[PDB]
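Researcher: Batch entry, complex prediction.
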Amino acid sequence: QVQLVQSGGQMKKPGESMRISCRASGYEFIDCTLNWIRLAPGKRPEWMGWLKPRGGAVNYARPLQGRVTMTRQLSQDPDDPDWGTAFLELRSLTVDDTAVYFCTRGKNCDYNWDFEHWGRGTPVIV
Amino acid sequence: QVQLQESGPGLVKPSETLSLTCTVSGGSISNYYWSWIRQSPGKGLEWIGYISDSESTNYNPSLKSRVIISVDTSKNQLSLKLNSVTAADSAIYYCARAQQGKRIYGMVSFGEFFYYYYMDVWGKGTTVTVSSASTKGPSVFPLAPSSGTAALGCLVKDYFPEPVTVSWNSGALTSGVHTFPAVLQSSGLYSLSSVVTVPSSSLGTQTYICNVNHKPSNTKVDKKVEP
Amino acid sequence: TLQCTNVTNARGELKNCSFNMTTELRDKKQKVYSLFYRLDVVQINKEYRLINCNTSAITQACPKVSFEPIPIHYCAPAGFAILKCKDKKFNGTGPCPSVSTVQCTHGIKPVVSTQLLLNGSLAEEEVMIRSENITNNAKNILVQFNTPVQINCTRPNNNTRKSIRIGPGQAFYATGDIIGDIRQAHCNVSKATWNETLGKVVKQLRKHFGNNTIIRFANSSGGDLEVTTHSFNCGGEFFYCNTSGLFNSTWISNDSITLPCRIKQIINMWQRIGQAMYAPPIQGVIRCVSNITGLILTRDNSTT
Amino acid sequence: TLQCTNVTNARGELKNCSFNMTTELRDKKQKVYSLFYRLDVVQINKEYRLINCNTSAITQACPKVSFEPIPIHYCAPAGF
Amino acid sequence: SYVRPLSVALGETASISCGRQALGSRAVQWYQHRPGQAPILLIYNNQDRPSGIPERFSGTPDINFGTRATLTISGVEAGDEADYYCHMWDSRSGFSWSFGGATRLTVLGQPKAAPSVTLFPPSSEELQANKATLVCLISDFYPGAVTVAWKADSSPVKAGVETTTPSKQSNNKYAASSYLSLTPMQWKMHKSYSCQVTHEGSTVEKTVAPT
Ligand SMILES: *[C@@H]1O[C@H](CO)[C@@H](O[C@@H]2O[C@H](CO)[C@@H](O[C@@H]3O[C@H](CO[C@H]4O[C@H](CO[C@H]5O[C@H](CO)[C@@H](O)[C@H](O)[C@@H]5O[C@H]5O[C@H](CO)[C@@H](O)[C@H](O)[C@@H]5O)[C@@H](O)[C@H](O[C@H]5O[C@H](CO)[C@@H](O)[C@H](O)[C@@H]5O)[C@@H]4O)[C@@H](O)[C@H](O[C@H]4O[C@H](CO)[C@@H](O)[C@H](O)[C@@H]4O[C@H]4O[C@H](CO)[C@@H](O)[C@H](O)[C@@H]4O[C@H]4O[C@H](CO)[C@@H](O)[C@H](O)[C@@H]4O)[C@@H]3O)[C@H](O)[C@H]2NC(C)=O)[C@H](O)[C@H]1NC(C)=O
Ligand SMILES: *[C@@H]1O[C@H](CO)[C@@H](O[C@@H]2O[C@H](CO)[C@@H](O[C@@H]3O[C@H](CO[C@H]4O[C@H](CO)[C@@H](O)[C@H](O)[C@@H]4O)[C@@H](O)[C@H](O[C@H]4O[C@H](CO)[C@@H](O)[C@H](O)[C@@H]4O)[C@@H]3O)[C@H](O)[C@H]2NC(C)=O)[C@H](O)[C@H]1NC(C)=O
Ligand SMILES: *[C@@H]1O[C@H](CO)[C@@H](O[C@@H]2O[C@H](CO)[C@@H](O[C@@H]3O[C@H](CO[C@H]4O[C@H](CO)[C@@H](O)[C@H](O)[C@@H]4O)[C@@H](O)[C@H](O[C@H]4O[C@H](CO)[C@@H](O)[C@H](O)[C@@H]4O)[C@@H]3O)[C@H](O)[C@H]2NC(C)=O)[C@H](O)[C@H]1NC(C)=O
Ligand SMILES: *[C@@H]1O[C@H](CO)[C@@H](O[C@@H]2O[C@H](CO)[C@@H](O[C@@H]3O[C@H](CO[C@H]4O[C@H](CO)[C@@H](O)[C@H](O)[C@@H]4O)[C@@H](O)[C@H](O)[C@@H]3O)[C@H](O)[C@H]2NC(C)=O)[C@H](O)[C@H]1NC(C)=O
Ligand SMILES: *[C@@H]1O[C@H](CO)[C@@H](O[C@@H]2O[C@H](CO)[C@@H](O)[C@H](O)[C@H]2NC(C)=O)[C@H](O)[C@H]1NC(C)=O
Ligand SMILES: *[C@@H]1O[C@H](CO)[C@@H](O[C@@H]2O[C@H](CO)[C@@H](O)[C@H](O)[C@H]2NC(C)=O)[C@H](O)[C@H]1NC(C)=O
Ligand SMILES: *[C@@H]1O[C@H](CO)[C@@H](O[C@@H]2O[C@H](CO)[C@@H](O)[C@H](O)[C@H]2NC(C)=O)[C@H](O)[C@H]1NC(C)=O
Ligand SMILES: *[C@@H]1O[C@H](CO)[C@@H](O[C@@H]2O[C@H](CO)[C@@H](O)[C@H](O)[C@H]2NC(C)=O)[C@H](O)[C@H]1NC(C)=O
Ligand SMILES: *[C@@H]1O[C@H](CO)[C@@H](O[C@@H]2O[C@H](CO)[C@@H](O)[C@H](O)[C@H]2NC(C)=O)[C@H](O)[C@H]1NC(C)=O
Ligand SMILES: *[C@@H]1O[C@H](CO)[C@@H](O[C@@H]2O[C@H](CO)[C@@H](O)[C@H](O)[C@H]2NC(C)=O)[C@H](O)[C@H]1NC(C)=O
Ligand SMILES: *[C@@H]1O[C@H](CO)[C@@H](O[C@@H]2O[C@H](CO)[C@@H](O)[C@H](O)[C@H]2NC(C)=O)[C@H](O)[C@H]1NC(C)=O
Ligand SMILES: *[C@@H]1O[C@H](CO)[C@@H](O)[C@H](O)[C@H]1NC(C)=O
Ligand SMILES: *[C@@H]1O[C@H](CO)[C@@H](O)[C@H](O)[C@H]1NC(C)=O
Ligand SMILES: *[C@@H]1O[C@H](CO)[C@@H](O)[C@H](O)[C@H]1NC(C)=O
Ligand SMILES: *[C@@H]1O[C@H](CO)[C@@H](O)[C@H](O)[C@H]1NC(C)=O
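Model: Structure tokens for the complex:
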């Protein structure tokens, strides 16, 4: 029962920044890698970067380096200990950043690029 | 169906028994719940108490130390006696029939229900004012027109307390009538001014007489209106 | 020392207790509150305290372990063997005529129950009763149904679980408040299915006591709470169901029977004197569906 | 609750914290102090506290065990 | 009890939310109470209405716990201006003795109506009774807020005038009296008396002379 829950949509202006979440549940958070994909109309789906909750190791895409930042915040309470919150921050926004931002996960934690699970989407309008 | 009508002194002195009664119409008294409600100016509705079809007592604890709601089934009449009244007890008293509803949310055997009460039919209301000042009758002074369409009425000067009822030709003339809200003068007496719009053809001559009634004074005066 | 009140209603069962509790810092206190069923608290002289304090320590159950009975298979080591018994009218003792061997037993579900055996294995053909010596009244008689009587149980209250940090990593899970209605936990059985099943049990009971004697059913005669009531687990909380409505029939020759159940969080289980367990409250509405397949009776000087 | 200051210098890294600590007798306290690198403490609102307190318990390493990597040899059992 | 304001437009929809939300299963009553008048039972059981209430008055039932009790008035009229009460009965709270708070629905955008001033001279019986009284009757104006000014010949009076607070009529308009008590000699020693009623935008004058 893998389920990814994101935050609500935001309307931003050029120069500001954004912060969106992605609470996962139903699987070991630190074992599977998470991604961030933006989808703009009339463009290719752009991969922003992946983040491994094991230590927070992250890898940003080149067209976004310096403007993108991905963190995590896994709960430290062993009763519901199977959930983390991947945060995405994009600074110095432009009108080209207007799209719907998703967080994805592979079908299994061995191969990351078979995005079987997707979030409902976080639309952003700059 | 069922309709009600209250009737009270209209004026009770401070620290005294506020007697009252209410006669229902077209219905039996011993098979419905009955609720008393008072509504003061500036304050919201206040639930006095209620009596059952088994004649059971249950008053608002905000007033229970003074209320006693009785009932006599020989007629369709049930009473209400608040005592030790103060200035805050001035309100319109409505006579409404409560009906019992049983809201079940769980098991009826475990007692998982609660009883709610709703009033469906209401009375017209009886104004009760408390003041050490005695009663006072009015004094009607006619208002004549001065010539298509014209207007005439009756000036009901200094009286106390509220209210008064105005009829025209004992009840025949009822179109175009416009009884106005009274005015509490600084002397402590209300002044009401009735007026009726009338075609200029009937000015000479269709007899017009205003009927003025003020119950707290046992008065029933009339007067003509003519140029 | 607990400062408890009644939870607002009108019977005042589950309480609303507050207490000065430790924090993550050894020099800071906190005034937190929680709900406790009255079966878990006792007064001093209003002031209360947990029931187990003057008896034993208490360990809160880990809310990540499962209270669910899993089919467990018992196997004999190499060089040994397990002997089955495929006799479909085999009472407990004696020589089983049809015997087979197995490396492992079947899926044993370790369902902790009382009075009424739950989720057990049915019997083929007819319902047999056991007991080692049926004429010895001090021997628990084990009756094993052949058809399953459906029993439904529920705790209708919508509960909440509040995590209370009481130290470095010590998080006690309390009952926050009750969302929505406050009702009564209970169980249901089909009176028709229970009437015919109580008929099936009184059938085989005549083969040991006589074809003319009267057979009477009554509730428990006393003892602890764990024995006088149907005690078990439903969604993760321990009921204690008054079975007086199930055992009330004297036999000679749409429906729904509802049992009033209580709930406890401070239990010792088994019957050991030394340690009690706090079961953290189950969030949401509780309801479980089980079959009662057995029964543990106890007879009481002539021919009745 | 830790009462910390900077260790006298001029960057203020490692702190100088004092606290009411328990003793050998359960009814006596003591006002002892210690140095803690800032990576081990966080403020409240100066007052501090150990970083792990709102997360987990903490066990002090035995100062008689060795942190030194020793050549470990992995061997397969007989038949492997 | 204090009053909660509300402002909806004519012909739109209203959402009178209850001020005392329920704790368990609820049985809410809704009452339409015009000031100084008999209240009207709109909804007695959470969703049920009596005989004689339009469909445009709907109450929210509690099928799943969480949905708060609200009163929905679709297609509001000018006559829907009154007070609304939420009589909240639930399983957790005890006996609902008091009614709700007070939601005074005020409908905006009603037709603007000009007043109708009618000034009467003193009566001959009261002039014979050694007293005078001018009665400046105002009615059929909207919005109900008027300013009354009395002039003796041409000078303001101010002394001895009582004025009605603009009460509401049956046709959803407003009316108010205006009394000026004069001495029988002061009424005869002057040439004319006027009643300036300045409603909303501009004023309307009615004059009366002792002839
Ligand atoms: C284990 O065993 C247990 C023991 O057996 C067993 O316990 C049972 O639990 C369930 C739930 O857990 C209980 O079910 C509840 O039952 C309540 C009572 O329902 C009965 O009564 C009502 C009202 O009866 C009056 O009105 C009808 C007409 O409407 C008349 O015909 C009656 O004669 C009666 O009028 C007289 O009596 C009044 C006294 O109450 C007097 O005041 C009055 O003046 C008159 O003299 C009936 O409507 C019910 O009939 C329904 O069932 C029959 C079968 O007999 C069917 O034909 C048909 O389906 C009928 O609908 C029944 O007789 C219910 O109130 C309750 O449901 C409400 O409450 C819950 C929670 O509060 C709500 O979530 C739910 O939505 C319901 O709310 C509706 O109703 C309320 C009140 O009316 C409204 O305020 C609310 O807005 C909402 O209205 C909406 O729905 C209506 C339809 O439901 C609709 O009309 C509206 O327009 C609106 O859309 C709930 O169902 C059950 O009682 C327990 N058993 C016992 C014996 O107590 C348990 O289930 C077992 N299993 C387990 C544990 O797993
Ligand atoms: C078990 O027992 C505990 C008590 O130990 C209960 O917990 C308390 O529950 C009550 C309600 O029953 C809570 O009281 C409510 O607090 C709200 C919070 O507002 C506070 O903070 C603001 C600042 O933002 C202050 O201005 C305000 O005065 C409060 O101090 C209030 O908003 C609530 O007000 C309500 O009541 C008033 C008076 O009737 C109304 O006028 C208001 O409109 C409003 O309806 C109310 O006062 C209290 O805070 C709870 N305490 C704690 C520690 O949580 C549990 O509920 C109880 N559980 C069960 C199951 O019984
Ligand atoms: C972390 O923070 C702690 C504080 O919590 C520091 O510990 C304190 O350090 C100060 C020095 O910085 C100590 O103060 C010194 O105490 C000496 C002991 O004498 C005391 O006892 C005699 C009785 O025999 C009294 O007469 C005397 O008044 C003292 O009460 C003093 O001798 C020192 O005096 C010096 O200063 C004065 C005034 O400037 C000079 O005139 C003197 O000549 C002399 O040079 C001084 O007062 C204090 O005692 C320490 N406290 C504790 C509890 O140990 C840590 O040093 C700090 N650590 C770091 C790394 O920053
Ligand atoms: C006797 O045996 C019964 C069945 O073998 C036991 O009933 C089981 O009870 C447990 C806990 O009381 C239930 O577990 C719950 O699961 C639900 C979610 O399940 C629903 O969703 C899944 C999809 O993942 C679906 O496959 C299911 O069919 C359900 O639709 C949650 O509320 C909780 O997580 C809870 O753990 C079992 O589901 C339930 N099984 C059945 C078949 O009903 C009963 O408890 C046993 N009695 C005793 C005394 O042990
Ligand atoms: C919760 O409610 C019960 C039931 O009303 C209370 O029980 C009463 O306890 C007092 C003790 O002071 C007795 O004198 C009464 O006879 C009891 N009543 C009944 C019906 O048994 C109980 O005290 C309440 N608890 C709290 C904390 O308020
Ligand atoms: C409770 O009722 C019956 C007991 O016989 C079980 O349901 C049947 O189980 C058998 C064996 O798996 C199946 O062959 C039948 O098809 C089942 N019947 C139905 C209608 O599904 C049920 O599993 C029992 N539950 C327990 C023991 O937990
Ligand atoms: C029991 O109560 C919980 C909350 O106390 C309810 O959970 C809510 O469920 C709805 C879905 O219908 C969500 O939108 C809310 O966010 C949930 N609330 C919380 C606090 O998580 C639950 O629905 C209730 N269930 C029953 C049967 O009453
Ligand atoms: C116990 O609960 C189960 C499940 O709610 C009940 O089985 C349902 O019975 C009704 C009535 O025959 C059927 O319409 C449903 O389809 C059944 N549910 C399922 C999942 O099959 C059962 O009747 C209840 N028994 C008792 C004694 O309460
Ligand atoms: C279990 O339920 C039975 C009834 O179903 C309860 O019997 C009551 O017993 C007391 C004396 O102990 C009598 O005064 C009552 O009249 C009985 N009630 C009925 C309805 O007969 C029994 O008390 C319940 N068990 C417990 C532990 O409360
Ligand atoms: C230790 O030294 C650092 C560096 O001077 C202090 O950091 C200052 O903290 C205050 C907070 O009150 C800020 O307003 C300043 O801007 C900080 N300065 C710098 C350069 O960052 C720190 O407060 C000192 N700690 C103690 C306990 O004295
Ligand atoms: C324990 O407290 C620490 C305080 O530092 C929390 O960590 C910070 O949390 C805030 C917001 O919660 C973040 O903005 C910081 O980035 C966090 N800092 C670090 C170093 O993690 C921590 O989340 C708390 N833990 C729990 C379980 O509540
Ligand atoms: C907590 O301790 C204080 C000490 O003054 C006391 O007054 C208070 O009653 C205690 N709280 C409880 C719930 O007993
Ligand atoms: C079981 O059967 C044997 C013989 O069939 C019999 O001797 C024994 O008494 C029976 N068990 C009981 C408990 O009656
Ligand atoms: C057993 O039934 C009797 C008679 O109804 C009752 O007095 C007693 O309290 C019951 N005991 C239990 C444990 O249910
Ligand atoms: C130790 O406790 C006392 C209690 O009076 C307090 O004044 C002092 O500040 C505490 N010490 C520290 C280091 O906080």
